[PDB]
Amino acid sequence: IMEIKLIKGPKGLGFSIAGGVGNQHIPGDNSIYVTKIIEGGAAHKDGKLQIGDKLLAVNNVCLEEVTHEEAVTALKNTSDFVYLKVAKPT
């Protein structure tokens, strides 16, 4: 479980998600999952966000049991400052 404070840039936040209610990235599991950390991007520069991490929440917006479009909205309707709640698998 982690906190990631980030600054979105030219290429966005610099990573790609999957999952959510009705679009299960793993069977019987609607979590949002980071699937691709973009080379030389804000997250890749920050270095915390790893592949297979679970976005629990984005600033104030909780991504637990949300639709994919709901998740992507939340990650796309955000200023240059974004806080992230993630869960690092173990």
Binding site: G12, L13, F15, S16, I17, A18, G19, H25, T35, K36, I38, H68, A71, V72, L75, K76
Partner: peptide, 4 residues
């Protein structure tokens, strides 16, 4: 799947 979706880039942000």
């Amino acid at each position: 799947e979706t880039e942000v």
